[PDB]
Structure 1
Amino acid sequence: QCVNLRTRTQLPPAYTNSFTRGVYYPDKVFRSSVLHSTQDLFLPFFSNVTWFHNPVLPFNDGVYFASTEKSNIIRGWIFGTTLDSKTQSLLIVNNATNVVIKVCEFQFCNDPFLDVYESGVYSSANNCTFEYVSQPFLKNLREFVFKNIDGYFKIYSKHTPINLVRDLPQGFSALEPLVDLPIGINITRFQTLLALHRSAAAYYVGYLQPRTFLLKYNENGTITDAVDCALDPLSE
């Protein structure tokens, strides 16, 4: 049921500034009105993030995903190493009612997409291991952070009402932890899933690196400001 489209989806790979986005709560510890320095994986401040207007991209240590979403065009994500039935593959789909997560040796087509008139992008579902169902994730700004360490897959999410024209806004907002998976996979590449109807979506991608940050906790325990210690000497 899966066929390759004619026109090439050569979305322009532009570049833009990261500014001060990509900060998440490192743990579930409550702190009130205190400055804490922690070393972990973060997106460096004022970095260079890639803008797409869908080639397979390497996963590396962690991935920061940003979407100027309108009417929920992006629908799912694919994670794996060989992207076939020879290795376990992780599939996430946020359909109209719920979110479904599967860990199976699927057989994906060359150009998988949701198809509208649920899941048909895979020809086979062999040796399924883990299944999960939860509430749906989604002119809105959707921010996600995906990490995979020591057999644990961590997903952080944030939703924002935005009205800016083109690029990321100049602001600060922490990413609360959303989903944890106790499944051991060595994902190296990932993919995006589109709700394309047979008859232009843009997003931002950034990578993570290990570094030290200084976080400020207010009275109520919400992160309100952060400082990167590897930046200009004033920051150090």
Structure 2
Amino acid sequence: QCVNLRTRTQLPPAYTNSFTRGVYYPDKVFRSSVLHSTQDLFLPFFSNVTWFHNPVLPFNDGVYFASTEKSNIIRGWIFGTTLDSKTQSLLIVNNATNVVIKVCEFQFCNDPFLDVYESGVYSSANNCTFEYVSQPFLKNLREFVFKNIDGYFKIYSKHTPINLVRDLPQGFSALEPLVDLPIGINITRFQTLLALHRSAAAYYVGYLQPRTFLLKYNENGTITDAVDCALDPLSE
């Protein structure tokens, strides 16, 4: 039921400044009114991230994803190495009622999309190993961080009400952990899924690098400010 479209929905690959977004709680420890220095994977400050207004993108160490969501156009993600039943494949879809996570060897069409009149982007599904159902994830800003370390898939998320027109705001907001999954995959690429009816989506992508950060914990244990040590000499 999946075929390629007529025209090419080549979204413009623009560039934009990261500013001070992409900070998450690295663990589940509670600290009150203290400055803590840590070393982990982070999105560097004031980096350039890619803006899409739907190709294959490498996974690398981790992924930071952002969406200026308007009326819930984006639907889910696909992860894998060769993107076929010859290898493993992870599918995550947030439909109208719940979120579904599947670990199987799918046979996806060239240009998947959910479509409306459930899942039909895959021609076959065999040897399914892991299944998961939970509460749905979703003029809003949706920020997600995906990491895959030692056979563990970590998803952090945050939702923000924003009023700015085009780009990311000049603000700070930590990302709370959302999901941990005990599944061993060696993902290298990922995609994006749209609910396209037969008849232009803006989002931002950035990568993660290992470095050291300084974080400030207030009285209640909420991160309010951070400093990137590998920057201009004043920060160091």
Name the SS of the counterpart of 2:26 in structure 1: coil
1:117 aligned counterpart, secondary structure: coil
> Where does the alignment leave 5 or more consecutive residues of structure 2 unmatched?
none
1:122-180 C-alpha deviation (Å, 9 max, x unpaired): 00011000000000000000000000000000000000000100000000000000000
- For 1:73 and 1:25, the matched residues in 2 are separated by 28
- RMSD of aligned residue pairs (Cα, Å): 0.3
Distance in 2 between residues matched to 1:235 and 1:194, nearest whole Å: 41
| CA deviation after TM superposition for structure 1 residue 226, in Å | 0.2
Distance (Å, rounded) in 1 between the aligned partners of 2:87 and 2:223: 39
Distance in 2 between the 1:122 and 1:76 partners?
14
Q: Secondary structure at the match of 1:144?
A: strand
CA apart distance, 1:118 = 1.0
The secondary structure found in structure 2 opposite 1:26 is: coil
Encode CA deviations 1:91-116: one digit per residue, 9 max, x unaligned. 00000000000000000000000010
What does the per-residue CA deviation read over 1:172-204, in whole Å, with 9 as the maximum and x for residues that have no partner? 000000000000000000000001110111000
CA distance in 2, matches of 1:17, 1:64: 13
Counterpart CA distance in 2 for 1:214 and 1:124 is 47
Give the Cα–Cα distance (whole angstroms) in 2 for the partners of residues 46 and 76 of structure 1: 27
Shift of 1:9: 1.4
Residues matched between the structures, number: 236
Shift of 1:88: 0.7
The whole-number CA distance in structure 2 between the counterparts of 1:139 and 1:6 is 30
Alignment-derived partner of residue 142 in structure 1 = 142
Per-residue CA shift, 1:61-97, capped at 9, x if unaligned?
A: 0000000001110001000000000111000000000
Runs of 4+ residues over 6 Å off in structure 1: none
Distance 1:41 1:160 in 2: 23
- 1:115-194 paired onto structure 2 within 5 Å: 115-194=115-194
Whole-angstrom CA distance in 1 between matches of 2:87 and 2:148: 16
SS at match of 2:191: strand
Using the alignment, how far apart are the partners of 1:86 and 1:207 within structure 2? 27
Gaps of 5+ in 1: none
Q: Distance in 1 between matches of 2:162 and 2:117?
A: 31
Tell me the TM-score normalised to structure 2 length.
1.00
How big is the shift at 1:29? Answer: 0.2
8 Å contact from structure 2 (residues 9, 200) kept in 1: no
Measured against aligned partners, the alpha-carbon deviations of 1:43-65 in whole angstroms (never above 9, x if no partner) come to 00000000000000000000000
Aligned-pair distance for 1:5?
0.2
